[PDB]
mmCIF file of C-alpha atoms and ligand atoms in Angstrom:
data_model
loop_
_atom_site.group_PDB
_atom_site.id
_atom_site.type_symbol
_atom_site.label_atom_id
_atom_site.label_comp_id
_atom_site.label_asym_id
_atom_site.label_seq_id
_atom_site.Cartn_x
_atom_site.Cartn_y
_atom_site.Cartn_z
ATOM 1 C CA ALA A 1 110.332 16.316 181.308
ATOM 2 C CA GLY A 2 108.657 17.166 178.033
ATOM 3 C CA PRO A 3 105.446 16.206 176.190
ATOM 4 C CA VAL A 4 107.036 13.470 174.051
ATOM 5 C CA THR A 5 108.698 11.846 177.093
ATOM 6 C CA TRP A 6 105.381 11.745 179.042
ATOM 7 C CA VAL A 7 103.110 10.831 176.049
ATOM 8 C CA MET A 8 105.220 7.752 175.294
ATOM 9 C CA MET A 9 105.277 6.659 178.947
ATOM 10 C CA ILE A 10 101.474 6.959 179.152
ATOM 11 C CA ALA A 11 101.036 5.010 175.911
ATOM 12 C CA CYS A 12 103.227 2.128 177.075
ATOM 13 C CA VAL A 13 101.282 1.947 180.321
ATOM 14 C CA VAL A 14 97.824 2.085 178.668
ATOM 15 C CA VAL A 15 98.864 -0.683 176.244
ATOM 16 C CA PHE A 16 100.261 -2.753 179.129
ATOM 17 C CA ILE A 17 96.954 -2.344 181.004
ATOM 18 C CA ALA A 18 95.113 -3.702 177.947
ATOM 19 C CA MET A 19 97.531 -6.662 177.852
ATOM 20 C CA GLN A 20 96.507 -7.527 181.431
ATOM 21 C CA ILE A 21 92.755 -7.283 180.734
ATOM 22 C CA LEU A 22 92.785 -9.001 177.326
ATOM 23 C CA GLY A 23 95.853 -11.218 177.557
ATOM 24 C CA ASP A 24 99.189 -10.880 175.738
ATOM 25 C CA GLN A 25 98.251 -12.795 172.578
ATOM 26 C CA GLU A 26 95.108 -10.763 171.843
ATOM 27 C CA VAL A 27 97.072 -7.509 171.872
ATOM 28 C CA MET A 28 99.953 -9.104 169.972
ATOM 29 C CA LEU A 29 97.663 -10.079 167.081
ATOM 30 C CA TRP A 30 96.761 -6.418 166.503
ATOM 31 C CA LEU A 31 100.030 -4.639 167.475
ATOM 32 C CA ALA A 32 102.887 -6.994 166.438
ATOM 33 C CA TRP A 33 105.012 -6.561 163.300
ATOM 34 C CA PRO A 34 103.039 -8.061 160.320
ATOM 35 C CA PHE A 35 103.497 -11.865 160.354
ATOM 36 C CA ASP A 36 101.793 -12.225 156.965
ATOM 37 C CA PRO A 37 102.488 -10.135 153.796
ATOM 38 C CA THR A 38 98.733 -9.549 153.390
ATOM 39 C CA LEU A 39 98.824 -7.451 156.592
ATOM 40 C CA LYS A 40 101.613 -5.239 155.245
ATOM 41 C CA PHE A 41 99.467 -2.096 154.868
ATOM 42 C CA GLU A 42 98.570 -2.083 158.552
ATOM 43 C CA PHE A 43 101.117 0.729 159.008
ATOM 44 C CA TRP A 44 100.655 1.047 162.770
ATOM 45 C CA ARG A 45 102.334 -2.366 163.181
ATOM 46 C CA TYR A 46 105.812 -1.065 162.208
ATOM 47 C CA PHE A 47 105.806 1.152 165.322
ATOM 48 C CA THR A 48 103.224 -0.420 167.677
ATOM 49 C CA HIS A 49 105.520 -3.362 168.649
ATOM 50 C CA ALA A 50 107.550 -0.855 170.711
ATOM 51 C CA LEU A 51 104.584 -0.319 173.069
ATOM 52 C CA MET A 52 104.147 -3.934 174.217
ATOM 53 C CA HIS A 53 105.784 -5.365 177.378
ATOM 54 C CA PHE A 54 105.611 -8.860 178.893
ATOM 55 C CA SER A 55 106.598 -8.096 182.495
ATOM 56 C CA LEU A 56 105.925 -5.278 184.918
ATOM 57 C CA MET A 57 109.609 -5.305 185.538
ATOM 58 C CA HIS A 58 110.510 -5.122 181.851
ATOM 59 C CA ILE A 59 108.325 -2.050 181.645
ATOM 60 C CA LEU A 60 109.645 -0.497 184.734
ATOM 61 C CA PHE A 61 113.194 -0.944 183.478
ATOM 62 C CA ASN A 62 112.475 0.546 180.011
ATOM 63 C CA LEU A 63 110.481 3.606 181.096
ATOM 64 C CA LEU A 64 113.245 4.424 183.598
ATOM 65 C CA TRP A 65 115.931 4.463 180.845
ATOM 66 C CA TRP A 66 113.486 6.239 178.496
ATOM 67 C CA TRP A 67 112.649 8.983 180.979
ATOM 68 C CA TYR A 68 116.346 9.493 181.850
ATOM 69 C CA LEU A 69 117.757 9.444 178.285
ATOM 70 C CA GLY A 70 114.604 10.499 176.392
ATOM 71 C CA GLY A 71 113.914 13.360 178.828
ATOM 72 C CA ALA A 72 117.497 14.536 178.335
ATOM 73 C CA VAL A 73 117.135 14.642 174.537
ATOM 74 C CA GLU A 74 113.788 16.442 174.674
ATOM 75 C CA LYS A 75 114.998 19.025 177.204
ATOM 76 C CA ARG A 76 118.289 19.869 175.388
ATOM 77 C CA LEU A 77 117.461 19.260 171.713
ATOM 78 C CA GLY A 78 113.646 19.554 171.544
ATOM 79 C CA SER A 79 110.563 17.343 171.043
ATOM 80 C CA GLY A 80 111.064 17.066 167.256
ATOM 81 C CA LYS A 81 114.513 15.479 167.799
ATOM 82 C CA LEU A 82 113.115 12.846 170.192
ATOM 83 C CA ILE A 83 110.196 12.065 167.823
ATOM 84 C CA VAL A 84 112.628 11.343 164.951
ATOM 85 C CA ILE A 85 114.983 9.044 166.945
ATOM 86 C CA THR A 86 111.888 7.221 168.228
ATOM 87 C CA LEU A 87 110.276 6.668 164.808
ATOM 88 C CA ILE A 88 113.433 5.662 162.918
ATOM 89 C CA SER A 89 114.794 3.366 165.642
ATOM 90 C CA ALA A 90 111.394 1.720 166.230
ATOM 91 C CA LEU A 91 110.961 1.003 162.508
ATOM 92 C CA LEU A 92 114.587 -0.225 161.956
ATOM 93 C CA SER A 93 114.960 -2.185 165.220
ATOM 94 C CA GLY A 94 111.680 -3.936 164.326
ATOM 95 C CA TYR A 95 112.808 -4.623 160.733
ATOM 96 C CA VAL A 96 116.022 -6.240 161.930
ATOM 97 C CA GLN A 97 114.486 -8.189 164.843
ATOM 98 C CA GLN A 98 111.917 -9.606 162.409
ATOM 99 C CA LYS A 99 114.655 -10.961 160.106
ATOM 100 C CA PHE A 100 116.675 -12.388 162.951
ATOM 101 C CA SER A 101 113.856 -14.462 164.392
ATOM 102 C CA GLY A 102 110.411 -13.511 163.101
ATOM 103 C CA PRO A 103 107.603 -11.131 164.124
ATOM 104 C CA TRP A 104 106.755 -12.162 167.735
ATOM 105 C CA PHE A 105 108.637 -9.614 169.850
ATOM 106 C CA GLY A 106 107.904 -6.348 171.665
ATOM 107 C CA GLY A 107 109.357 -3.699 174.010
ATOM 108 C CA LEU A 108 110.818 -0.188 173.928
ATOM 109 C CA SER A 109 114.349 -1.499 174.386
ATOM 110 C CA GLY A 110 115.260 -1.066 170.714
ATOM 111 C CA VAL A 111 114.387 2.615 171.064
ATOM 112 C CA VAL A 112 116.347 2.599 174.396
ATOM 113 C CA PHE A 113 119.558 1.251 172.808
ATOM 114 C CA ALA A 114 119.280 3.951 170.121
ATOM 115 C CA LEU A 115 118.972 6.581 172.908
ATOM 116 C CA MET A 116 121.981 5.016 174.724
ATOM 117 C CA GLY A 117 124.103 5.239 171.532
ATOM 118 C CA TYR A 118 122.916 8.736 170.533
ATOM 119 C CA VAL A 119 123.365 10.356 173.975
ATOM 120 C CA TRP A 120 126.841 8.791 174.351
ATOM 121 C CA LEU A 121 128.271 9.664 170.897
ATOM 122 C CA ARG A 122 126.598 13.135 170.844
ATOM 123 C CA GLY A 123 128.073 13.947 174.265
ATOM 124 C CA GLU A 124 131.545 12.841 173.132
ATOM 125 C CA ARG A 125 131.673 14.578 169.755
ATOM 126 C CA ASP A 126 129.501 17.540 170.679
ATOM 127 C CA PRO A 127 129.724 18.303 174.464
ATOM 128 C CA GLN A 128 128.008 21.731 174.003
ATOM 129 C CA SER A 129 124.731 19.848 173.387
ATOM 130 C CA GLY A 130 124.600 19.312 177.169
ATOM 131 C CA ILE A 131 123.724 15.591 176.987
ATOM 132 C CA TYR A 132 126.110 12.734 177.837
ATOM 133 C CA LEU A 133 126.304 9.140 179.018
ATOM 134 C CA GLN A 134 128.447 8.193 182.053
ATOM 135 C CA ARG A 135 131.145 5.611 181.165
ATOM 136 C CA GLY A 136 129.585 3.607 184.020
ATOM 137 C CA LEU A 137 126.276 3.452 182.137
ATOM 138 C CA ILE A 138 127.995 2.485 178.901
ATOM 139 C CA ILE A 139 129.311 -0.288 181.145
ATOM 140 C CA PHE A 140 125.736 -1.435 181.905
ATOM 141 C CA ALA A 141 124.688 -1.089 178.312
ATOM 142 C CA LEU A 142 127.513 -3.300 176.986
ATOM 143 C CA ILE A 143 126.988 -6.059 179.609
ATOM 144 C CA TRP A 144 123.243 -5.934 178.890
ATOM 145 C CA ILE A 145 123.777 -6.339 175.137
ATOM 146 C CA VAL A 146 126.284 -9.251 175.327
ATOM 147 C CA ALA A 147 124.151 -11.033 177.970
ATOM 148 C CA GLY A 148 121.387 -11.257 175.330
ATOM 149 C CA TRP A 149 123.773 -13.151 173.058
ATOM 150 C CA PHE A 150 123.555 -15.820 175.766
ATOM 151 C CA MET A 151 115.928 -14.752 178.945
ATOM 152 C CA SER A 152 114.749 -14.423 175.340
ATOM 153 C CA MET A 153 116.165 -11.043 174.292
ATOM 154 C CA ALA A 154 115.370 -9.446 170.940
ATOM 155 C CA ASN A 155 119.039 -9.362 169.947
ATOM 156 C CA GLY A 156 118.540 -7.790 166.502
ATOM 157 C CA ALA A 157 116.446 -4.979 167.948
ATOM 158 C CA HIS A 158 119.268 -4.148 170.414
ATOM 159 C CA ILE A 159 122.084 -3.992 167.843
ATOM 160 C CA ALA A 160 119.987 -2.236 165.204
ATOM 161 C CA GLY A 161 118.747 0.315 167.772
ATOM 162 C CA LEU A 162 122.305 0.955 168.975
ATOM 163 C CA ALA A 163 123.603 1.335 165.426
ATOM 164 C CA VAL A 164 120.768 3.711 164.536
ATOM 165 C CA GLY A 165 121.539 6.050 167.484
ATOM 166 C CA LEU A 166 125.281 6.040 166.723
ATOM 167 C CA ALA A 167 124.699 6.908 163.027
ATOM 168 C CA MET A 168 122.238 9.713 163.908
ATOM 169 C CA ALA A 169 124.505 11.208 166.608
ATOM 170 C CA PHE A 170 127.452 11.012 164.179
ATOM 171 C CA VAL A 171 125.492 12.888 161.476
ATOM 172 C CA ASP A 172 124.137 15.420 164.019
ATOM 173 C CA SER A 173 127.665 15.987 165.395
ATOM 174 C CA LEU A 174 129.095 16.884 162.002
ATOM 175 C CA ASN A 175 126.244 19.424 161.694
ATOM 176 C CA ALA A 176 126.547 20.907 165.225
ATOM 177 C CA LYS B 29 108.891 -18.082 171.910
ATOM 178 C CA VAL B 30 108.318 -14.331 172.205
ATOM 179 C CA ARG B 31 111.458 -12.164 172.417
ATOM 180 C CA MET B 32 111.849 -9.075 174.612
ATOM 181 C CA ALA B 33 113.212 -5.792 173.234
HETATM 182 CL CL1 CL C 13 116.770 -12.296 168.421
#
């Protein structure tokens, strides 16, 4: 597993430790997507929402997927590739989740759905990349997404993440 | 509420 895989897992854990010491809301006020236009130049906020989790089990479940799928991208395609998927999906999954239902959300699962979509489509159109997603796991992923349509899931983060990963894998598959 | 991504 590479530097970007590990750095992100450490970050999410450090931030979650702060959320236990200080309480959820205190961290949310400083890390959530800007709830007020005046705050709009607090640039960290467009990415920082990805680092917050509200359960130990929601953070165990996300770092697992992230280490599996993120580690695969870093190993096969490099650190720079994983940084870009991370940054774009975090920004765009946040943007869409905000419009669906406002700024009070968090979790890496937007980034995870982009990794699910990227690894799958890249492995299908471009097998020589040496990444792929089992059809079994694309099972999981699809049940998980539709289940949020009906636990208060950030539904716009999930679809926007997924879409982002598909588009990037599509573009990268042309080019490969 | 808060939503979970
Ligand atoms: Cl939502």
